[PDB]
Design a protein around this ligand. Structure first.
Ligand SMILES: *[C@@H]1O[C@H](CO)[C@@H](O)[C@H](O)[C@H]1O[C@H]1C[C@](C)(N)[C@H](O)[C@H](C)O1
Ligand SMILES: [Zn+2]
Length: 7
């Protein structure tokens, strides 16, 4: 990944 969140 590499992006973040949270969903
Ligand atoms: C998510 O990123 C922030 C910014 O670098 C960190 O401070 C944080 O500790 C990090 O969360 C960890 C723990 C978690 C939420 N269980 C996940 O594994 C994420 C990817 O990494
Ligand atoms: Zn991931």
């Amino acid at each position: 990944x590499x992006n973040x969140x949270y969903x």
